[PDB]
């Protein structure tokens, strides 16, 4: 009744994340500002990737809507209408509930529900479709009947849902902002262990993107002589600073660890399901290794095997402190994949340690996965 | 097979405009600033409607994608991704072509395809879907094989379409601008008379949706106090533009004229077939009066009495000039019925003249249809 629903949601979130790898590749290639690509190229590609990642919530809404409606386009249109209505009404009503002057809400992001808003809107659309796509109205009202009725009720519900969330969410956003702001002033290693663990926790319900902004873009600051200012870790690194690369722990589990988890899941299938599982696992591992997108791998075992995801999260959190301790410097554009690992080489210090610690993390991930899956008989993809 | 494909375009365009009723309700009853609603409710409804309208190009893209792909949702996702990428690519490439700062272009909407650009994005999505929805990508790349590849290649083609559009737009944009200025502010009388006549002539086939797209979504340019810019006639009236409301002549022949024609057809039926025809024609008259859907009435006699349809087309074409000249302003969501008349009356002007001109139209239609069917001996339903 609920576990099946969560499994459905995870399964339907796959088509939305099928486009993320290419957007990530485009953004990473463009943001490098290569010395050979004409600027208009690496401008257009960067903007395209940014557009995909900005519409991410809408893609998620459409994917959720089609997941529970047997891939019906009317559900997607209703989802788009509902998402727009919900976002605008939330923005409008939040400053009145919170009595802040309509600007601190956007500056501090207390009304940006992120991808979870897409999920809510898509669920609204799917439920309304499932309930009203065969609605029989009187003949003189026949035009607004059947699937034509769904986009109206989906949006009449969106306005009310946005009104509801404008009161139940700023407490959540305010909390996710304070801690995630307390985490910076916290000692260095503690700060980024917290970052890694909480990001792994948050990615499932689509607001780790909100979590990242403070630590990617705002934690730091640096301006050397004639150079311009840069106020974050992701930018300060690509800005060749001497102390960014505090997010260099992403490579350990996004290029070496989760691929190992994917292969471990692959090698623990049924005597015949191996062939079918292998292709998807290999594709997911390749995507994670290359473009630094881990959602295809995580969503594949997250809901069936929550303990594996908790162990993941602990490992990802552990990755950042060790990389800081050894020094392990290498930066990011949007994620931590091969393309970013290479193009942002720049001032990547101690960059030879990444392959070996990555092999260690692959060993550990594979060991825990193939041990726990066999022991508890978890029905990960293939079982 | 051009006729079938044009009808396919017509229905693909009908779908996007079918979600206009929700924006109608919200924005029309919000921007009216009714004294019986608290101001916050009006603000919230107005912004929700504005959000629905700001995605009109996106809804058009989704509708085009679904119409040509047998309602497949992956087409809608491809349409969203492609539209976003195309818009951003144009935004970055147009200043190269026009040799003007991007700030000025963004401020004065020089690079703004609008609903047309939404249609291009939807066409891209539909084409790439129908061509690559059974692709067999390599075994290790199976995570993207199939419908998962359609959004990928659609978004890839979006960049190229965006550059091509940034190169070939200026003339198209200037041409549209001049119709958008003649049809709205120079000669609305003759422009909308032509509109009415052509739409009546195109209804028998289903291409009136193509004929309406410009007049209902392109002409004009209005900016609310909030700063959102509105285009078309329906959005312009809903926003509160004093110069909108040109499509208000639909009420004269949809609410008063065609119901009169239906009653005339019923009253001219033979005795043995006056009860049955009475039921059918009352149903059709109610459908026209309330919703604004006129095809049950017009199909009753159009193929068995074309001359009556020519007279009706002339009268409908004359309706729009008459309103424009007498100042009778009132908006519509999708068609001209009773509900649209009542709900979109906030920004209306001279709403009292509508019933009087309407009873005039009803008398004219009734007398014309009765006398002509009696003399010419037309075999309209019943005879
Ligand atoms: O969601 C796409 C990517 O966003 C990045 O910011 C995160 O670090 C990755 O874990 C994630 O795969
Ligand atoms: O068919 C749907 C409706 O489309 C409108 O644009 C036309 O004006 C009506 O005559 C028609 O009923």
| Resolved by | cryo-EM
Assigned token pair, B298: 């017009």
Comparing alpha-carbon positions, the chain A residue that sits nearest to B81 is A52
| Cβ contact, residue pair A76, B77, below 8 Å | yes
Nearest to B111 by CA among B49, B163, B51: B163
For residue B223, the surrounding DSSP H or E stretch is strand B222-223
**Exposure class string for A54-91: b at 16+ Cβ within 10 A, else e:** ebbbbbbbbbbbbbbbebbbbbbbbbbbbbbbbbbbbb
Q: Give the C-alpha separation, B353 to B337, whole Å.
A: 16
Dihedral over alpha carbons A263, A265, A267, A271 (to 10 degrees): -150
Q: B43 touching A, CB under 8 A?
A: yes
> Which of B19, B73, B80 comes nearest A55 by C-beta?
B80
Residue at token pair 């601190």: A104
Does residue A357 contact residue A350 with C-beta atoms inside 8 Å? no
DSSP state of A216: I
**Cβ contacts of B213 within 8 Å, gap of 6 or more:** B13, B115
Q: How many CA atoms lie within 13 A of A55 on its CB side?
A: 27
Give the residues across from B222 on adjacent strands: B230
How would DSSP label each residue in B69-136?
TTS-HHHHHHHHHHHHHHHHHHHHHHHHHHTS-HHHHHHHTSS--THHHHHHHHHHHHHHHHHHSS--
Ligand 1 centroid to Cα of residue A323, in Å, is 18
Per DSSP, the residues of B130-191 read HHHSS----GGGTTTSGGGHHHHHHHHHHHHHHHHHHHHHHHHHHHHHHHHHIIIII-HHHH
Please state, in angstroms and rounded to a whole number, the distance separating the CA atoms of residues A265 and B374.
81
Q: Diameter of chain A by CA atoms?
A: 76
* 8 Å CB contact between B189 and B325: yes
Shortest distance between the Cα of B44 and any Cα of chain A, in A, equals: 6
* Closest C-alpha to ligand 1, atom 10: A294
Alpha-carbon gap, residue B380 to B31, rounded angstroms: 45
- Report which ligand 2 atom has the smallest distance to the Cα of B291: 12
Please give the C-alpha separations between residue B250 and each of B197, B244, B273, B329, B354, in angstroms, as whole numbers.
11, 14, 31, 11, 11
CB-nearest partner of B44 from A76, A92, A155: A92
Distance CA B94, CA A111 (A): 33
Instruction: Work out the burial of residue A344: count CB atoms within 10 Å of its CB; fewer than 13 is exposed, 13-18 middle, 19 or more buried.
Output: buried
Nearest Cα to A305, choosing from A369, A249, A255? Answer: A369
Instruction: State in Å: Cα B259 to ligand 1 middle.
Output: 60
Burial readout A249-277 (b: 16 or more C-beta within 10 A, e: otherwise):
bbbbbbbbbbbbbbbbbbbbbeeeeeeeb
Q: Burial code of B207-239, b = ≥16 C-beta within 10 A, e = fewer?
A: bbbbbbbbbbbbbbbbeeeeebebbbbbbbbbb
Residues ≥6 apart with Cβ < 8 Å to B332: B24, B234, B247, B248, B250, B292, B340, B344
**Rounded distance between C-alpha atoms, residue B358 and residue B349, angstroms:** 16
| Whole-number Å distance between alpha carbons of A295 and A305 | 15
Question: How far does the CA of residue B19 sit from the closest CA of chain A (Å)?
Answer: 6
Radius of gyration of chain B (CA): 23
Q: Which atom of ligand 1 is nearest to the CA of A254?
A: 10
d(Cα B114, Cα B173) in Å, to the nearest integer? 10
Strands B222-223 and B229-230: antiparallel
Contact yes or no for B249/B268 (Cβ under 8 A): no
Q: What angle do CA B41, B46, B50 make, to 5 degrees?
A: 150
Is residue B44 less than 8 Å (CB to CB) from chain A?
A: yes
Judged by a CB distance cut-off of 8 A, whether residue B227 touches chain A is: no
Mutation site for B-interface testing, chosen from A76, A90, A139 by largest number of B Cβ within 10 Å: A76
Give CA–CA dist A194/A210, Å, rounded. 15
Q: Could you give the 3-state DSSP secondary structure of residue A377?
A: coil
Q: Which of B30, B44, B70, B161 to mutate to test the interface with A (most CBs of A within 10 A)?
A: B44
Q: What is the end-to-end Cα distance of chain B in Å, rounded?
A: 35
Tell the residue nearest (CA) to atom 7 of ligand 2: B335
H or E element, residue B229: strand B229-230
Residue bearing tokens 């409607």: B49
What is the rounded distance in angstroms from the CA atom of residue A290 to the CA atom of residue B350? Answer: 65
Contact A236, A230 (CB under 8 A): yes
B89 lines ligand 2 (CB under 6 A): no
Contacts of B25 (CB under 8 A, 6+ apart): B45, B49, B333, B343
Tokens of A140: 């003189």
Residue with tokens 């690079």: B111
Q: For residue A192, give the H/E element and its range.
A: helix A188-202
Q: Rounded to whole angstroms, how far apart are CA atoms B259 and B203? A: 17
Strand partners, A206: none
**Spatial CB neighbours of B252, under 8 Å, sequence gap ≥ 6:** B316, B319, B322, B323, B354, B357, B358, B361
How many CA atoms are closer than 13 Å to the CA of B354, on its beta-carbon side?
A: 25
Name the minimum distance, in Å, from the CA of B23 to any CA of chain A.
9
Q: Is the CB of B295 under 6 A from ligand 2?
A: yes
Nearest to B144 by CA among A299, A270, A282: A282
Residues contacting B283, CB < 8 A, separation 6+: A139, A140, B296
Q: Is B184 exposed, middle or buried (0-12, 13-18, 19+ CB in 10 A)?
A: buried
Tell me, yes or no, if A93 comes closer than 8 A to chain B by beta carbon. Answer: yes
Cα separation, B180 vs B175, in Å, equals: 9
Cβ within 8 Å, pair B77-A62: yes
CA distance A345 to A286: 21
DSSP element (H, E) containing B326: helix B306-326
Give the C-alpha distances (Å, rounded to integers) separating B177 from A29, B181, B219, B306: 38, 6, 8, 36
User: Is B58 in contact with A80 (Cβ distance < 8 A)?
Assistant: yes
What DSSP element (H or E) covers B222?
strand B222-223
Considering only CA atoms, which of B310, B177, B295, B194 is closest in space to residue B247?
B194
- Chain B partners within 8 Å of A151 (Cβ): 18-19, 22
How many Å separate Cα B217 from the centre of its chain? 7
Q: Is the Cβ–Cβ distance between B259 and B248 less than 8 Å?
A: no
Nearest CA to ligand 1 atom 2: A293
Question: How many angstroms separate the Cα of A346 from the Cα of each of A37, A66, A244, A342?
Answer: 18, 43, 12, 9
Cα B20 from Cα B53, distance rounded (Å): 8
Cα(B336)–Cα(B21) distance, rounded to whole angstroms? 12
Contact A125, A60 (CB under 8 A): no
- Report d(CA A182, CA B218) in Å as an integer: 50
Interface contact B143-A88, CB threshold 8 A: no
**Which residues of chain A lie closer than 8 angstroms to B74, CB-CB?**
15, 66, 71
Contact A73 B77 (CB under 8 A): no
Measure CA A193 to chain center: 18
- The span from the CA of B16 to the CA of A383, in Å, is 44
Residue B230 per-residue DSSP state? E
Question: How far apart, in Å, are the Cα atoms of B331 and each of A16, A275, B242?
Answer: 38, 61, 12
Q: Counting beta carbons within 10 angstroms of the beta carbon of residue A160, is it exposed (0 to 12), middle (13 to 18) or buried (19 or more)?
A: middle
Position of tokens 């209505």? A85
Closest Cα to residue A155, out of B46, B32, B26, B333? B26
Kindly state the helix (H) or strand (E) to which residue A363 belongs, with its residue range: helix A353-376
Q: Which of A22, A339, A47 is nearest to B163 (CA)?
A: A47
Q: Give the C-alpha separation, B383 to B376, whole Å.
A: 12
Rounded CA gap, A253 and A314, in Å? Answer: 11
Q: How far is CA A265 from CA A382, B134, B291, in A?
A: 8, 27, 57
Q: Which of A55, A156, A283 sits opposite B84 (nearest CB)?
A: A55
DSSP label at B329? B
Cα–Cα distance between B42 and B253 in angstroms, integer? 32
Which residues, in sequence order, are bridge partners of residue B349?
B329
CB pairs under 8 A between A and B: 190
Q: Assign B31 to helix, strand or coil.
A: helix
Q: How far is CA A350 from the centre of its chain?
A: 28
Please list, residue by residue across A311-329, b when 16 or more beta carbons sit within 10 angstroms of its beta carbon and e when fewer do. Answer: bbbebbbbbbbbbbeeebb
* Alpha carbon of B111 to ligand 2 centroid (Å): 31
């Amino acid at each position: 009744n609920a576990f099946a629903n969560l499994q459905k949601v995870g399964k339907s979130l796959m088509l939305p994340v099928s486009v993320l790898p290419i957007a990530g590749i485009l953004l990473g290639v463009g943001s490098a500002n290569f010395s050979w690509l004409p600027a208009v190229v690496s401008h257009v590609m960067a903007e395209a990737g940014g557009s995909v990642f900005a519409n991410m919530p809408l893609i998620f809404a459409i994917g959720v809507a089609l997941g529970f409606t047997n891939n019906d386009g009317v559900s997607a249109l209703a989802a788009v209408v509902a998402y727009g209505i919900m976002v605008k009404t939330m923005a409008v009503v939040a400053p009145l509930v919170l009595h802040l002057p309509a600007e601190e809400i956007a500056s501090k992001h207390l009304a940006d529900t992120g991808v979870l808003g897409g999920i809510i809107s898509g669920a609204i659309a799917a439920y309304m479709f499932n309930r009203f796509y065969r609605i029989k109205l009187p003949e003189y009202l026949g035009f607004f009947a059947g699937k034509r009725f769904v986009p109206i009720i989906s949006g009449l519900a969106a306005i009310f849902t946005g009104v509801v969330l404008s009161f139940i969410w700023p407490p959540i956003g305010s909390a996710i902002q304070t801690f995630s702001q307390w985490a910076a002033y916290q000692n260095p290693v503690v700060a980024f262990g917290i970052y890694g663990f909480i990001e792994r926790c948050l990615v499932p319900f689509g607001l780790h993107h909100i979590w990242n902004v403070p630590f990617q873009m705002q934690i730091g600051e640096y301006t050397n002589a004639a150079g311009q200012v840069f106020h974050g870790d992701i930018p300060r690194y690509m800005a060749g600073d001497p102390t960014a690369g505090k997010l260099s722990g992403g490579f350990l589990f996004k290029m070496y660890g989760l691929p190992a988890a994917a292969i471990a899941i692959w090698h623990s299938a049924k005597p015949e399901n191996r062939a079918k599982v292998g292709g998807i696992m290999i594709s997911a591992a390749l995507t994670s290794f290359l473009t630094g997108i881990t959602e295809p791998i995580e969503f594949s075992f997250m809901f069936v095997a929550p303990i594996l995801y908790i162990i993941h999260a602990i490992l990802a959190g552990l990755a950042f402190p060790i990389c800081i301790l050894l020094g392990m410097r290498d930066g990011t554009s949007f994620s931590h994949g091969l393309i970013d690992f290479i193009v942002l080489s720049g001032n990547s210090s101690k960059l030879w340690l990444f392959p070996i610690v990555g092999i260690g993390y692959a060993i550990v991930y594979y060991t825990i996965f193939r041990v726990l899956i066999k022991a508890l008989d978890l029905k990960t993809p293939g079982r």
